[PDB]
Amino acid sequence: KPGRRRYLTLVMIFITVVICYVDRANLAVASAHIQEEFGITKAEMGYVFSAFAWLYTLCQIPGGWFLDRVGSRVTYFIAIFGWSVATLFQGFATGLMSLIGLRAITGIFQAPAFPTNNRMVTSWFPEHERASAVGFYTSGQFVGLAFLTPLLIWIQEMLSWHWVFIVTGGIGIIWSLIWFKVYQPPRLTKGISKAELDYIRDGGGLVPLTAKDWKLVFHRKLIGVYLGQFAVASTLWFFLTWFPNYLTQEKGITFMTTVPFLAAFVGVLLSGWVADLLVRKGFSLGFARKTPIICGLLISTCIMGANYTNDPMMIMCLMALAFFGNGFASITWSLVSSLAPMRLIGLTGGVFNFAGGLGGITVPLVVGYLAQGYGFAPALVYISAVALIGALSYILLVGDVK
Ligand SMILES: O=C(O)[C@H](O)[C@@H](O)[C@@H](O)[C@H](O)CO
């Protein structure tokens, strides 16, 4: 009865966020064959992984500027059709230099995925259901990064390894042109409902660099929010890049690739829904999403307790609970669109994950730096410290709705 096509764009985004995260972990799937063919060393492989991580964060502040400058639609086509071509060409790469360069190119076009979807969902879902929308396409990340990894392995072992980059890259190419022709602003869309467009707008859904603005974006209210995701997105990047299973593996654990990614799946899902229901009630817009972020980041510190047993106990349960707190508090960016000024929606989205994605580059490096000289115990307290620092820095500098 009410507007129904508004969620169509949400599904297309969910599809995009899935495809975007498949091209993130497709390299890890083939990482057991890429080293052997080119004769690459373990250290050199790190360049291939790092190539995507670095440019992904560095190419957000240009993307944030590129998003507002060029628009919200064409940017995603250039993005989807951008990285999808790089990934496709990676299947025909000759030498690690071709892989490092292409993975760099892949990170460039895939960087403006976070700010572009945010404005896209904010121009279509700036209401109470933005958290349910934010908690919807984020689940596709945990699903798209994992639930498709077995299918890649199936295509990897039976057929050649190149098809993993042709499938993931080829699907993205088709999806860009598909998405390019179907999605468009609400008024300019073919079928617009008289009630939906007003329904979308009643919540706030609408279609050079200044020195002053340059210093204002780095404000206390946004700074405390920037630091918040530095502790949220980081925990997800261990699983993406550096450390699924590396050193000291006999007395680390013993199935591990699906447990935390479900707890976060429903974690982001219900958390986006809990904040969604709370906000429509007599609670503030920030407090409805702030609350599940604080306790979540507090739940994220639950992993510190896994070392008290050192015995084949139910660590996996509290492991999923600790990862549930990150997912439950994974809608930390659902409010960045609100606090950010109307003029600079793209830049804030970049500088935002520029702290979160950076967390995916520095936090994994810290956990590794102490595991050789010390062990895993200082790594669990650090993740809890970053989560506590994330929570602590949030509750103090949250500053509600600026
Ligand atoms: O790519 C992205 O959207 C960001 O990394 C981040 O928003 C996601 O990883 C998730 O929402 C939080 O970890």
Author numbering: 24 to 230, 243 to 289, 295 to 442
Provide excerpts from the study.
Members of the solute carrier 17 (SLC17) family catalyze the coupled transport of anions driven by a proton electrochemical gradient ΔμH+ (= Δψ − 2.3× (RT/F) × ΔpH, where R is the gas constant, T is temperature, and F is Faraday’s constant), with contributions from both electrical potential Δψ and proton gradient ΔpH (pHo/pHi). DgoT is composed of 12 TM helices and belongs to the MFS fold. Two 6-helix bundles (N- and C-terminal domains) are related by a pseudo 2-fold symmetry axis perpendicular to the membrane plane.
At pH 9.0, this complex crystallized in an outward-facing conformation, in a different crystal form than for the WT protein alone, and refined to an R-factor/Rfree of 28.5%/30.0% at 3.5 Å resolution. The structure includes residues 24 to 443 except for the 11–amino acid dynamic region in the cytoplasmic loop (residues 231–243) and 13–amino acid periplasmic end of TM7 (residues 276–291). In addition to the rigid-body motions of N- and C-terminal lobes, TM7 bends inward over the substrate and provides a periplasmic gate for the outwardly oriented occluded state.
